[PDB]
Design a protein around this nucleic acid. Structure first.
Lengths: 136, 78, 386
RNA sequence: GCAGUCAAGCGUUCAUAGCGACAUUGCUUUUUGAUUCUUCGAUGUCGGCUCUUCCUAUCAUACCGAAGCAGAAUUCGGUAAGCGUUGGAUUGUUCACCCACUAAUAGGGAACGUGAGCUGGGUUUAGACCGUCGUGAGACAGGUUAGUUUUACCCUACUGAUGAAUGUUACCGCAAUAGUAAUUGAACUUAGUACGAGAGGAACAGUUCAUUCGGAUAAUUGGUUUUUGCGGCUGUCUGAUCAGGCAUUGCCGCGAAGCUACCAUCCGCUGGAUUAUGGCUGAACGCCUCUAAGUCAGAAUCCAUGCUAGAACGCGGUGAUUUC
RNA sequence: CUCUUAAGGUAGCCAAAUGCCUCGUCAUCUAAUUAGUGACGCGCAUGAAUGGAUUAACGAGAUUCCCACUGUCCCUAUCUA
RNA sequence: GUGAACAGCCUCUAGUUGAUAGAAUAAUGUAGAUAAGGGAAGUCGGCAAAAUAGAUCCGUAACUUCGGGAUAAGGAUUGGC
């Protein structure tokens, strides 16, 4: 996260390291996003900077419109597919790793979102909370 | 604390226990244990698993709860 | 040369030597500071760790998103039977340290404590404290004078206590014994409190109270001679590595032409004596009572004892302590509690706690039920039953 | 390579906020050279992987000072090496050039650390190709491809584990010494306030979280499965059924216990003496001056508190102390 | 135009296993490429049975990219003999 | 016998039951295996390992020395009675 943050984030297990590919949720004309970096990552030798839900990342488009391909853009993660714990005690996970496109200060490039999201993201990125059909 | 029910086995789930799964259609399932979760991933059906509440229901085992609804025979008398 | 990509160290140099403890009972290397105004109380206690369970409560931490909202936490349970007091000793200060000059004991001792002065009990006359006990029976002469000596000297006092092991399921029979410092006032008053509590018992309620932060001390679990990667945390070498890969490759340079104390080598893991602090209490419980695991919300008369007992320990028919988190020590192990040394405000230690629900479900499996009656009502009758 | 002295000029004005010509004094040995002292009855010869430590000529962080410093951002400098200093494309590469994150992506040493620790991509045997040279064999820090990496059971060091003798034996303890660890950031509020014409735009305290590291643990989640525990499946053999054998643990699903993971959870202390610096009183020098005497506050510093081992030749208290 | 040779490198091909300068210039591939591919050519020092250019199939040959795949790795853990 | 098959696995006739043993189950090893989420980020280099795999049916490109490529690619089915 970072500049567009509407607050803080309790930890959640990392599933999305770099070289990862996650489907795109919105109607921006993209299909998949290829992660390369994570805002807020640390620095340890030979550790891969990993992403989780709610995080903002830098990503490219390996499939979609050439209006978006071949450049790097900020993105947000909304589904993780790895079990993570909530402090109410329950572990949960979706079935797919999914994200959207954004500008550095939080606003989305698209207008809509397909499928559900995480409350841990909708509570941190409000513009996502508007264009969300579901929050869980 | 709310006590939830297993989407697969019908058993009861106390907090901090089991898992929760979220499917692409934005639906939710709650599992008590990796057993149920694994069979769900293997896309079995509970109606053919013999230790489930749905099975025991559909086969009318432990079905001594519901008996019948009686028949009324009485005039208006007014 | 100039290590290419700098990185941190693998391991703490402050928990060396990573070796075995000399006694399974760890020793309190520090007691709190005394205030000579308060009443007489203990700074410590002893208990046998039983195991963990699960706990749900409601949070009071404003600013958080989880405010006035349920959260689960994982606690650990300590069987703290009424400890017994046998004797006190007196330390006086020197330029070369606190030094004992007298240890005074009581008259009648139990045959679960005077097994601690033997390595072979079954073949002995048991012949212990038999003359010290005859030192009594003439009113106090050789004893009260020792007490007066202690009052006349001995800026510091420590009380000898022993567990009531027999009330536990264990097969030890050999009481654990320990010195515990007092932090009341008027060393005379201290020793008088003691002399009164000789041959007598002390519960944990007088000492600890709910929502109090403590420190827990114990000998951590043993795993044995272990290698470098799991004793410290080094990298596994790559796959194509002749002569093994769970190793450390460079253990030094040509100069200093020796091997340094700082280098990760192999050896013992576990059975180290450790101290973990700021472990909040969530409950004190009385064994002379059922509904120990009951609350103002659940109100099902069940004990803390899970279904099928605790694993490798048993039942908790005695008093107990339910404390937050994961403390050192495996089950069945002696655990030395301690009050905190400093006052910790923190907005996280002054939190008042009120439980909501407790887990009694089995730990010997994926326990579904919290209670046999619940199980019966859910499943219905069975072939065994009628 | 680094730092100095001076000061002509730049800097609107102004030598010195920051720079700094012509000249000049030095350090260092992380470049390359010069030399040829040691080694040719061999010191295993590039780079990377791993791992520790050290230096400071400090990239960042703590506290401060100066400014051509209004705020913000930024630059010079001081104490300080406590703490941290990345992921990747290409290259055999060191060096390098880019992408991105980051508080930051500083420099270096240790037989140009580290091959009985790895690898062996490169150089640097033998095979082969090309180009140029050569009559030719053949040559080329010119290019390309393929090409055996040995031994530790000895001494020491290190890590851990016992252990004779101290009248015996058992228990409870003290603590000399040694080691030491916690780190950094964001958001909310402070505040669109201070500040400033406006543009723009802070900080202290407080709270919630997070990064890196560490130490424990295993309630839950996940993994593992010779519980060969349950069940199923194939082929075959026991005449058939039941029950089972073999298939280098036959295979599949579930799978307790145990072990374990930032793939799970919890925890990670506060007091004093100081540095730089700013000050008080106050002389020297009838005044003035933080210093000469004396003294106050003050840093991620240092020592303690706390944490870990406990001198096997440091110690104390206590119990019992063999009869044929 | 000129000097000169026995003749003066023709057709073709190229930073190719042959190109010093050199990580050549342009484009594409990539988020990013001293790599790879396609083109340019005053080519240190290409080149015609010292065989030139090309070439389907084949190749335990050298090399780059993509899909699937995965403990190679993030980051290790566990079991068996 | 299974099976396309003197493949591999089991068994009958015939032959061996020989290879220094016993008790425990620490590290490091050799051989074998499994692993969430991601999927070559590792690395000189996808080395090793995994994945795929048989049979029947469908469908099959560029290019071509018209013979091949081609099991191309890429998909479906498979038991017992």
């Amino acid at each position: 996260s970072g500049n567009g943050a509407q607050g803080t984030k309790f930890r959640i297990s990392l599933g999305l390291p770099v070289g990862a590919i996650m489907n795109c949720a919105d109607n921006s004309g993209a299909r998949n996003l290829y992660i390369i970096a994570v805002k807020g990552s640390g620095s340890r030798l030979n550790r891969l900077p990993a992403a989780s839900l709610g995080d903002m990342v830098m990503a490219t488009v390996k499939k979609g419109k050439p209006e978006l391909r071949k450049k790097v853009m900020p993105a947000i993660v909304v589904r993780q597919a790895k079990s993570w714990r909530r402090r109410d005690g329950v572990f949960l996970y979706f079935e797919d790793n999914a994200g959207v496109i954004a500008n550095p200060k939080g606003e989305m490039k698209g207008s809509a979102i397909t499928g559900p999201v995480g409350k841990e993201c909708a509570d941190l990125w409000p513009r996502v909370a508007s264009n969300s059909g579901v929050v869980v | 604390m709310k006590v939830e029910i297993d989407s697969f086995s019908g058993a009861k789930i106390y907090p901090g226990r089991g898992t929760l799964f979220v499917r692409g259609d934005s639906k939710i399932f709650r599992f008590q244990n990796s057993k149920s979760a694994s069979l769900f991933k293997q896309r079995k059906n509970p109606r053919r698993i013999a230790w489930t509440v749905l099975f025991r229901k559909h086969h009318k085992k432990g079905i001594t709860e519901e008996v019948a609804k009686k028949r009324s025979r009485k005039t208006v008398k007014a | 040369s100039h290590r290419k990509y700098e990185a941190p160290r693998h391991g703490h140099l402050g928990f060396l030597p990573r070796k075995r403890a000399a006694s399974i009972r760890a020793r309190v290397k520090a007691f709190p500071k005394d205030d000579r105004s308060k009443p007489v109380a203990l700074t410590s206690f002893l208990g046998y760790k039983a195991g963990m369970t699960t706990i749900v409560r409601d949070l009071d931490r404003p600013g958080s998103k989880f405010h006035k909202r349920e959260v689960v936490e994982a606690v650990t349970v300590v069987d703290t039977p009424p400890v017994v007091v046998v004797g006190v000793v007196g330390y006086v200060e020197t330029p070369r340290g606190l030094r004992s000059l007298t240890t005074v004991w009581a008259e009648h001792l139990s045959d679960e404590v005077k097994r601690r002065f033997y390595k072979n009990w079954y073949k002995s006359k048991k012949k212990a404290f038999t003359k010290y006990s005859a030192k009594y029976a003439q009113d106090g002469a050789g004893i009260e004078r020792e007490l007066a000596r202690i009052k006349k000297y001995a800026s510091v006092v420590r009380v000898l206590v022993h567990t009531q092991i027999r009330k536990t399921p264990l097969a030890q029979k050999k009481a654990h014994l320990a010195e515990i410092q007092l932090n009341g006032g008027s060393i005379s008053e201290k020793v008088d409190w003691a002399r009164e509590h000789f041959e007598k018992t002390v519960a944990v309620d007088s000492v600890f109270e709910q929502n109090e932060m403590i420190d827990a001390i114990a000998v951590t679990k043993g795993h044995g001679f272990e290698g470098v990667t799991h004793r410290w945390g080094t990298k596994k070498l790559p796959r194509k590595t002749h002569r093994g890969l769970r190793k450390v490759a460079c253990i030094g340079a040509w100069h200093p032409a020796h091997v340094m104390w700082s280098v990760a080598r192999a050896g013992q893991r576990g059975y180290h004596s450790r101290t973990s602090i700021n472990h909040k209490i969530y409950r004190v419980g009385k064994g002379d009572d059922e509904a120990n695991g009951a609350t103002s919300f659940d109100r099902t008369k069940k004990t803390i004892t899970p279904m099928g007992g605790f694993v490798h320990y048993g039942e908790i028919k005695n008093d107990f302590i339910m404390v937050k988190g994961c403390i050192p020590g495996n089950r069945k192990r002696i655990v030395t509690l301690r009050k905190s040394l400093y006052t910790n405000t923190s907005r996280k230690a002054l939190e008042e706690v009120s439980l909501k629900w407790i887990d009694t479900a089995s730990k010997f499996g994926k326990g579904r039920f919290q209670t046999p009656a619940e199980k019966h009502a859910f499943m219905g009758t069975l072939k065994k039953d009628l």
